[PDB]
């Protein structure tokens, strides 16, 4: 579970993201498409070309959800319920792919927050993404 320390860490690092969340969301996707091409099978309907607006559009949505989980760090299961439902019932993304995105999100943050991406923060952000992923996957079976 996430500790007070963890919560402070996450709010802090995410705090810094501010208004760039959108762009950092799009970048994490691109990174994921490039490094783990198998993830592409879920977006056959998307234009995955560099600077794709669909990707831009999608990065923003993902970012908003993360931003929402941070705002509700003490009630994520509830704050994310709807999204947990969508993923379990419609999208049905195989669970293994959450860890890939998580990973690309962490690289993206690292690449943008050198001052904040400390060992302690890194660990907190990793536990956090892991928790989001678990919520999103909780209603799979």
């Amino acid at each position: 579970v996430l500790s007070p320390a963890d919560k402070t860490n996450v709010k802090a690092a995410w705090g810094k993201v501010g208004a760039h969340a959108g762009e950092y969301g799009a970048e994490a996707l691109e990174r994921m498409f490039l490094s783990f091409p198998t993830t592409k099978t879920y977006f056959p309907h998307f234009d995955l070309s560099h600077g794709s607006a669909q990707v831009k559009g999608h990065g923003k949505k993902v970012a908003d959800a993360l931003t929402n989980a941070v705002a509700h760090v003490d009630d994520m299961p509830n704050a994310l319920s709807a999204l947990s439902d969508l993923h379990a019932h419609k999208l049905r993304v195989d669970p293994v792919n959450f860890k890939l995105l998580s990973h690309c999100l962490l690289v993206t943050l690292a690449a943008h927050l050198p001052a904040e991406f400390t060992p302690a923060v890194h660990a907190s952000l990793d536990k956090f993404l892991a928790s989001v992923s678990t919520v999103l996957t909780s209603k799979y079976r």
Binding site: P37, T38, T39, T41, Y42, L91, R92, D94, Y140
Partner: protein, 146 residues
């Protein structure tokens, strides 16, 4: 493969005893039931609302036979699964959009079906060899993804 002549023979010999028709239907159906999310690829099949509805669905059973068929033929090119599944690998990526992870889920289901079916006969050493083949097959199938 990195199969030992001994490992090759164990695989080969148990398979000789397999009814692909039944094992194929059961393996694919168990998949749709254990890991409900794999049903995303079979909406056109019908009602998969229950174990029963899945296990009974003829469309599933028939796809199951098509899949183990292909698998079965792959066991004859155990020394070049890559080349045997190349076109099937492309199809799966480019046409079907099947996440390769699915190949691994099935493989594990396959092993449970074999154990289920052969009880005693499906010994630790025999499972080990099968685990190497399912892994091998999955890799072969995922090989052309880009």
């Amino acid at each position: 493969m990195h199969l030992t002549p001994e490992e090759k023979s164990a695989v080969t010999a148990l398979w000789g005893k397999v009814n692909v028709d039944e094992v194929g239907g059961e393996a694919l159906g168990r998949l749709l039931v254990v890991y409900p999310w794999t049903q995303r690829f079979f909406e056109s099949a019908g009602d998969l609302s229950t174990p029963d509805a899945v296990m009974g669905n003829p469309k599933v059973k028939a796809h199951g036979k098509k899949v183990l068929g292909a698998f079965s033929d792959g066991l004859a090119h155990l020394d070049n699964l890559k080349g045997t599944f190349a076109t099937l690998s492309e199809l799966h990526c480019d046409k079907l959009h099947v996440d390769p992870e699915n190949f691994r889920l099935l493989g594990n289901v396959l092993v449970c079906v074999l154990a289920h079916h052969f009880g005693k006969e499906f010994t630790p050493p025999v499972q080990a060899a099968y685990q190497k083949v399912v892994a091998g097959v999955a890799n072969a199938l995922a090989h052309k993804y880009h």
